[PDB]
């Protein structure tokens, strides 16, 4: 039995995408060691059906621990942003435990995320072949690598323009971050895997492959679908609404919008008169009277909501989303138009790809980089409340039809590449 | 590797349901020998993706052959109804070749259909455990078995009444004895293509009446990925959403000229868009296609039923209510307009109506189809959509069925595991 150890970065969206990939490999008769910190393994375990537990086994990675940084903070999920430097420093210090895990389990293959340059170095030292898996889409990576080779040329194959707000958000420190990220891709054996699909990003995949001089293999759409978490009361509330009348509002697992940002979002929801379910979180807030004036149109869920189940409900007509890639992939699969309110990292590029595909719209920031309640209201009105953007709704339906038609063949290329790589390395061993 | 030989009855609907069940066992690491006549194996091979061919292997069963009854007629698909006695007799005579196949391949398990009492007998003689798999739903079986045990009491848990057209001695008893033997002879359990949200109380009742465990393995529904589709798709793409009915009477029925006349006039009066599969043995009123214009399309011989039912333009399914077609329509959320023809179909239409995911065009007292019934129901369900209730339940049923996954086969796999562990001891 061929064994693969999988090492996602310590973020919930990363663990989620890796676990969907783990199931696909389990269905192809691989045995999977799924390796993360205990707090992340606990968070993702409800997403693993019991039928997989014989072939997908959780392996705890130990980070350095202190009473000031204890194991329940060894995740980006709800982490105070100012502990991100500590979290990254401790993850890099896990390389010795990770070496011991690889020596004990001796897996045939390592699949690793793009935030751990040490991981393919440890694997190589044990003669364990290793492949990089990216849980972003392709667009953002191609946009970052293009200016390195073509500093005086516009990015081709897109009219996307990154807002000045993110253009400025020591160039030497920024360079070293990019060198570590690219090393993870560059070090990958023969191919890199990425959670995307050609109908959406084929031209960018081909370009990235030319730029990196490595084959890019899509393995998406990777989308978790559950089989209470508070859904019983949420479903009963959604059941009282008209079809396609409600927006779900969420900024993912590792972002806390500021008070000023929440004000613009809240006033936008209010002016649109939409029904809304809004997940509000606080690290491990709303205008006075906002909920009271919303009345039965609004619901705030504290901490966490059953995102997939809400997006699949017949009452849901829109998704006000930070445009994290898993959330975008879910919304496309479920056919819910995205109203993009991107915040940072890959999100503004994801919102631009959503907009260019015609399956969603982006709420634009003002020149000073602030969210605009007027934009948010206008786009919710057009996409959900009055539905004058029938073009967006049609493209969203058509994309979901495309994504629902994909099956296990989406993994054929990855499996063939893994097979070839292990047969070659067995010779060289 | 545990091996299973599967022996459907020689009908396309049966091979279809058996192949979907074969795929589910293959994903559970069984090796499948899929056994049927060559004409049937040829017909079903497009529905088997290449990824399965290493673990689902086709095995040819030979029936007796003659120039008057050659191998391309060894199927009910498009077969002249007056050759059905010959096909059944030929299938019985295949029991010898079937024994040789079981001896050669030595499968660990036989799964067999309900039209071959000799099959579990051959398996038993070779000490091969055998399980019956039914490609109907359960309602029809419980309705047939109930009056045997309760001749003076009405069937419970349903108000369905079988029209006198289908109501109307020793030969009938002998047919029922052979069918029930297939179920009764099954080892430990019978398998059936159904699911509890739709037929739970009937499964429980059948299990009591047969004194055997009934294990559901449904919904079993083929979904594809040309065969004419590219042109049909371009035609559907020009229609309004949910505006079009697909019309089909399955693989082994040819409606009479009289029936075709009533269906045709019902379609015309409704002013619905329609795609209608019309077949001739291995027809329409004069001017009907002309007057229909671009509203109607006749497809000769065969159509990509699943792709059509899944299209955004399809709002209804005028169906003979064969069980695979009912299961597909429920899975895809398309309301059924039932025009059942024979065998289990009037019972299936009754269950559809009871569940509220479709409606049944009722026949006249003398058994004739009524063009006014067909037109009225198409108008109410598809064209005017005043039966919002039917469309909603169809949608809610589609969501239920889409929520099911690989767990629907857990009970079957566990029973198979137990049965083989027991019989390994005894042999
Ligand atoms: C800084 C360097 C690695 C940083 C890490 O360091 C590692 O640390 C040690 C211990 O930790 C490890 O043990 C490793 O040994 C050591 O890593 C080695 O680092 C050397 C360079 O120091 C590589 O040579 C060698 O391979 C690699 O192993 C880090 C973060 C851990 O410190 C990065 C890795 C990805 C990479 C190679 C990119 C992406 C891909 C490349 C480009 C430049 C040019 C090429 O691209 C081609 O250029 C043509 C002209 O335009 C195009 O025509 C064509 O299209 C395009 O393909 C290429 C594919 C090589 C490019 C943009 C380079 O600028 C800079 C590179 C950014
Ligand atoms: C691989 C690289 C990713 C870079 C890409 O980003 C990613 O891109 C998205 C795709 O779009 C992804 O999906 C992720 O979401 C997104 O990642 C997030 O990005 C946001 C803001 O951008 C952060 O807020 C958040 O935290 C981070 O996770 C990028 C920037 C190219 O885009 C990661 C980022 C953090 C980082 C730089 C750490 C931490 C700090 C560094 C170390 C190595 C050495 C240095 O650190 C050493 O240690 C101490 C630091 O002070 C000092 O003592 C000493 O001087 C120094 O040597 C250094 C500072 C460079 C170290 C351990 C590196 O190996 C590996 C790095 C892990
Ligand atoms: C198991 C039984 C199924 C009976 C059930 O039906 C099924 O129920 C649905 C579920 O709802 C299913 O899904 C199927 O669609 C539906 O099936 C179809 O039903 C329609 C009309 O309803 C036919 O048009 C069509 O053909 C048939 O497939 C039923 C009736 C209970 O409902 C089958 C049907 C035919 C039959 C009776 C044959 C053929 C003929 C018979 C033999 C056995 C012995 C006899 O043979 C004679 O033996 C004599 C010596 O004793 C000789 O004198 C003589 O020469 C010889 O003929 C006999 C005539 C009874 C024989 C070989 C039997 O083993 C097995 C039988 C195979
Ligand atoms: C006619 C007979 C089989 C015909 C075939 O023959 C086979 O042919 C030989 C070679 O071909 C083979 O070698 C087989 O040996 C030989 O088959 C044997 O045939 C005898 C009876 O001759 C059985 O005894 C024995 O098991 C079985 O092996 C064939 C091929 C000719 O077609 C049929 C099979 C299914 C069956 C048993 C049913 C369904 C289930 C049963 C019922 C009635 C009573 C029971 O039901 C219970 O009744 C209670 C009171 O109401 C309720 O309390 C409870 O709820 C309910 O469970 C029971 C479960 C047994 C019932 C209605 C019976 O009438 C009649 C039966 C119809
Ligand atoms: C540490 C990293 C990698 O280890 O350093 C690598 C560094 C070399 O950058 C490599 C790559 C990113 O760019 C290659 C570049 C040299 O290409 C020049 C080309 C565009 O020709 C134009 C040139 C001015 O004019 C053309 C002239 C012939 O007319
Ligand atoms: C914002 C969002 C983040 O999620 O977008 C990310 C995107 C920007 O991706 C950046 C990444 C794909 O490239 C990083 C790059 C900017 O770093 C430069 C470094 C690798 O140069 C190497 C080497 C010296 O260059 C050789 C050159 C001098 O010839
Ligand atoms: O009781 C109700 C009815 C079902 O009983 C039939 C029974 C009196 O005999 C039929 C016999 C042929 O097989 C039944 C079985 C083997 O005994
Ligand atoms: C009348 C019902 C509902 O109105 O519809 C009939 C239809 C549902 O039948 C389909 C079939 C599935 O069930 C028939 C079979 C279960 O029993 C038939 C019986 C006459 O054969 C003799 C039988 C073995 O003998 C047993 C005993 C009397 O010896
Ligand atoms: O309240 C919530 C918020 C998020 N999610 C899930 O968390 C994932 C978030 O990943 P994404 O890539 O969208 O963004 P990230 O959290 O990485 O920023 C997605 O699977 C969402 O469905 C959820 O289930 N409930
Ligand atoms: O033109 C056609 C007619 C039928 N079918 C398929 O054939 C099966 C018919 O089986 P059903 O149980 O509905 O009735 P039967 O043919 O057994 O009477 C179903 O999978 C249909 O999708 C098809 O694909 N194209």
* DSSP codes joined into one string, B143-182: HHHHHHH-TTSPPTT------HHHH--HHHHHHHHHHHHH
- CB contact under 8 Å between B395 and A314, yes or no, is yes
Distance, CA of A201 to CA of A288 (rounded, Å) = 43
3-state SS, residue A118: helix
Please choose, from the candidates B174, B188, B135, the residue with its C-alpha nearest in 3D space to the C-alpha of residue B6: B135
Q: Which residue's alpha carbon is at the smallest distance from atom 11 of ligand 2?
A: A346
Which residues are registered as beta bridge partners of B247? B276, B318
Q: State how far residue B169 is from chain A, nearest Cα, in angstroms.
A: 49
Tell me how far the alpha carbon of residue B250 lies from the centroid of ligand 8, in angstroms: 24
The residue in chain A having the minimum alpha-carbon distance to the alpha carbon of residue B311 is A401
Ligand 1 contacts (CB < 6 A) are: A 117, 121, 148-149, 179-180, 182-183, 186, 210-213
Tell me how far the alpha carbon of residue A182 lies from the centroid of ligand 6, in angstroms: 7
Chain B residues 51-110 with a CB less than 8 Å from chain A: 51
Distance, CA of A113 to CA of B185 (rounded, Å) = 55
Distance, CA of A335 to CA of A243 (rounded, Å) = 14
Distance, CA of B72 to CA of A283 (rounded, Å) = 71
The residue in chain B having the minimum alpha-carbon distance to the alpha carbon of residue A405 is B225
Question: Which residues of A fall within a CB distance of 8 Å from B49?
Answer: 409
To test ligand 10's pocket by mutation, which of B250, B282, B308, B328 has the most ligand atoms within 8 angstroms of CB?
B250
Active-site residue flag, B14: yes
Contact A418, A110 (CB under 8 A): no
Distance, CA of B276 to CA of B296 (rounded, Å) = 8
Distance, CA of B193 to CA of A351 (rounded, Å) = 44
Q: Using a 6 Å cutoff on CB, does residue A247 contact ligand 2?
A: no
Contact B15, B8 (CB under 8 A): yes
Nearest atom in ligand 5 to A150's CA:
20
Residue A110: Cβ within 10 Å count? 25
Which ligand gives the minimal distance to the CA of A147?
A: 6
To test ligand 1's pocket by mutation, which of A122, A132, A179, A187 has the most ligand atoms within 8 angstroms of CB?
A179
What distances in angstroms separate CA B136 from CA B13, B217, B222, B259, B358, one per listed residue? Answer: 9, 12, 15, 24, 18
Whether the CB of B424 is below 8 Å from some CB of chain A: the reply is no
Element (H, E) at A35: strand A31-36
Please choose, from the candidates B324, B345, B375, B370, the residue with its C-alpha nearest in 3D space to the C-alpha of residue B162: B345
Q: Which long-range contacts (CB under 8 A, 24 or more apart) does B366-373 make?
A: B366/B165, B367/B163, B367/B164, B367/B165, B368/B258, B368/B262, B369/B258, B369/B259, B369/B262, B369/B263, B369/B339, B370/B262, B370/B266, B371/B261, B371/B262, B371/B263, B371/B264, B371/B265, B371/B266, B371/B269, B372/B266, B372/B269, B373/B266
Distance, CA of B211 to CA of A58 (rounded, Å) = 44
Phi, psi (degrees; rounded to nearest 5) at A344: -160, -170
Q: How many residues are there in chain A?
A: 429
A295 CB-side CA count, 13 A: 3
Distance, CA of B15 to CA of B38 (rounded, Å) = 12
Domain B3-218+405-426, CATH number (from 1.10.1270.20, 1.10.10.10, 3.20.20.370, 3.40.50.2000): 3.40.50.2000
Written as six digits, the tokens of B389 are: 């209730």
Which residues are registered as beta bridge partners of A280? A302
What distances in angstroms separate CA B278 from CA A20, B35, B257, one per listed residue? Answer: 44, 29, 11
Q: What is the resolution of the experimental data for this entry, in Å? A: 1.7
Contact A5, A105 (CB under 8 A): yes
Whether the CB of A242 is below 8 Å from some CB of chain B: the reply is no
Written as six digits, the tokens of B177 are: 């004895």
3-state SS, residue A18: helix
Element (H, E) at A146: helix A139-149
Nearest to B225 among A314, A397, A405 (CB): A405
- CB contact under 8 Å between B407 and A51, yes or no, is yes
Q: Which residue's alpha carbon is at the smallest distance from atom 1 of ligand 7?
A: B149
Element (H, E) at A422: helix A412-428
Mention every residue, 6+ apart, whose C-beta is less than 8 A from residue A286.
A262, A266, A280, A300
Q: How many H helices and E strands in chain A?
A: 18, 13
Interchain CB contacts (distance < 8 Å): A and B: 18
Mention every residue, 6+ apart, whose C-beta is less than 8 A from residue B44.
B12, B15, B16, B19, B36
Buried b (16+ CB within 10 A) or exposed e, A357-373: bbbbbbbebeeeeebeb
Contact A5, A131 (CB under 8 A): no
Distance, CA of B133 to CA of B34 (rounded, Å) = 14
Tell me how far the alpha carbon of residue A129 lies from the centroid of ligand 6, in angstroms: 25
Whether the CB of A344 is below 8 Å from some CB of chain B: the reply is no
A56 phi-psi bin (left φ>0, alpha ψ -120 to 50, beta other): beta
Q: Which fold has domain B229-402?
A: Rossmann fold (3.40.50)
Chain B residues 278-317 with a CB less than 8 Å from chain A: 312
Written as six digits, the tokens of B120 are: 């579990």
Tell me how far the alpha carbon of residue B177 lies from the centroid of ligand 4, in angstroms: 8
Tell me how far the alpha carbon of residue B161 lies from the centroid of ligand 7, in angstroms: 26
Residues of A with active-site annotation: 14, 113
Tell me how far the alpha carbon of residue B173 lies from the centroid of ligand 7, in angstroms: 13
Written as six digits, the tokens of A34 are: 């799924």
Whether the CB of A1 is below 8 Å from some CB of chain B: the reply is no
Nearest atom in ligand 7 to B148's CA:
4
In this structure, is the dihedral angle defined by the CA atoms of residues A207, A213, A217 and A223, taken in order, positive or negative?
negative
Which residues does a gap of C–N over 2.5 Å follow in chain B? 168, 225, 282
Question: Which residues of A fall within a CB distance of 8 Å from B27?
Answer: 27
CATH 3.40.50.2000-classified regions of chain A: 3-220+406-428, 231-404
Q: Which fold has domain A3-220+406-428?
A: Rossmann fold (3.40.50)
Distance, CA of B124 to CA of A183 (rounded, Å) = 63
Domain A231-404, CATH number (from 1.10.1200.10, 3.40.50.2000, 3.40.50.720, 1.10.3720.10): 3.40.50.2000
Please choose, from the candidates B226, B388, B197, B378, the residue with its C-alpha nearest in 3D space to the C-alpha of residue B306: B226
Written as six digits, the tokens of B2 are: 């545990």
CATH 3.40.50.2000-classified regions of chain B: 3-218+405-426, 229-402
Interface test mutation site (partner B, options A407, A410, A413, A419, max chain B beta carbons within 10 A): A407
Distance, CA of B151 to CA of A6 (rounded, Å) = 64
To test ligand 10's pocket by mutation, which of B13, B192, B194, B251 has the most ligand atoms within 8 angstroms of CB?
B251
**How many angstroms from the chain centroid is the CA of residue B114?**
13
The residue in chain A having the minimum alpha-carbon distance to the alpha carbon of residue B401 is A227
Distance, CA of B285 to CA of B268 (rounded, Å) = 11
Q: Using a 6 Å cutoff on CB, does residue A181 contact ligand 2?
A: yes
The residue in chain A having the minimum alpha-carbon distance to the alpha carbon of residue B395 is A314
Element (H, E) at B57: strand B56-60
- CB contact under 8 Å between B51 and A412, yes or no, is yes
3-state SS, residue A327: helix
Q: How many H helices and E strands in chain B?
A: 18, 13
Chain B residues 27-56 with a CB less than 8 Å from chain A: 27, 29, 49, 51
Torsion of CA A176, A182, A187, A190, to 10 degrees: -170
- The beta-strand segments (E) located in A263-387 are 275-280, 298-302, 316-321, 338-340, 360-362
> Which residue out of B113, B146, B265, B344 is catalytically annotated?
B113
Ligand 7 contacts (CB < 6 A) are: B 148-149
Helix, strand, coil % over all residues of chain B, rounded to 5: 50, 15, 35
Residue B254: Cβ within 10 Å count? 18
Distance, CA of B37 to CA of A335 (rounded, Å) = 43
**How many angstroms from the chain centroid is the CA of residue A199?**
19
Buried b (16+ CB within 10 A) or exposed e, B332-356: bbbbbbbbbbebbbbbbbbbbbbbb
Q: Answer whether the bond into residue B224 is a cis peptide, omega within 30°.
A: no
């Amino acid at each position: 039995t061929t064994t693969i150890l999988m090492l996602p970065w310590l973020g919930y969206g990363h663990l989620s995408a890796f676990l969907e990939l783990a199931k696909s490999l389990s269905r192809r008769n691989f045995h999977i060691y799924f390796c993360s910190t205990s707090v992340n393994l606990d968070a993702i375990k409800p997403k693993l059906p019991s039928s997989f537990s014989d072939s997908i086994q959780f392996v705890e990675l130990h980070l350095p621990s202190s009473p000031e940084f204890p194991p329940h903070l060894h995740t980006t999920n709800g982490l105070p942003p100012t502990l991100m430097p500590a979290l990254h420093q401790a993850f890099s210090m896990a390389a010795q435990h990770f070496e011991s895990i690889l020596q004990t389990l001796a897996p045939h293959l390592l699949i690793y995320d793009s935030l751990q340059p040490w991981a393919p170095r440890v694997a190589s030292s044990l003669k364990i072949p290793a492949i990089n898996f990216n849980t972003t889409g392709v667009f953002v990576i191609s946009q970052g690598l293009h200016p390195i080779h073509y500093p005086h040329s516009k990015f081709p194959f897109s009219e996307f323009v990154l807002h000045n707000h993110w253009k400025a958000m020591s160039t030497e420190r920024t360079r070293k971050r990019g060198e570590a990220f690219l090393y993870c891709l560059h070090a990958s054996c023969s191919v890199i895997l990425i959670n995307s699909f050609r109908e959406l990003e084929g031209k960018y995949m081909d370009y990235l492959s030319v730029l990196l001089n490595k084959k890019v293999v899509p393995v998406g759409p990777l989308v978790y679908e559950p089989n209470d978490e508070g859904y019983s009361s949420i479903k009963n509330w959604l059941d009282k609404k008209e079809p396609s009348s409600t927006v779900f509002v969420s900024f993912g697992s590792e972002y806390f919008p500021s008070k000023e940002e929440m004000e613009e979002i809240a006033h936008g929801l209010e002016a649109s008169e939409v029904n809304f379910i809004w997940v509000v979180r606080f690290p491990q807030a709303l205008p006075k009277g906002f909920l009271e004036r919303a009345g039965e149109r609004g619901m705030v869920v504290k901490g966490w909501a059953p995102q997939a189940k809400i997006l699949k409900h017949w009452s849901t007509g829109g998704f006000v989303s930070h445009c994290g890639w898993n959330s975008v992939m879910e919304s496309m699969m479920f056919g819910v138009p995205i109203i993009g309110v991107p915040m940072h990292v890959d999100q503004p590029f994801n919102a631009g790809l959503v907009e260019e595909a015609g399956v969603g719209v982006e709420a634009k920031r003002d020149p000073d980089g602030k969210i605009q309640r007027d934009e948010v209201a206008k786009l919710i009105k057009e996409v959900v409340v009055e539905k004058t953007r029938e073009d967006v709704r049609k493209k969203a339906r058509e994309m979901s039809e495309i994504l629902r038609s994909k099956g296990e063949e989406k993994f054929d290329e990855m499996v063939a590449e893994i097979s070839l790589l292990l047969k070659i390395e067995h010779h060289h061993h």
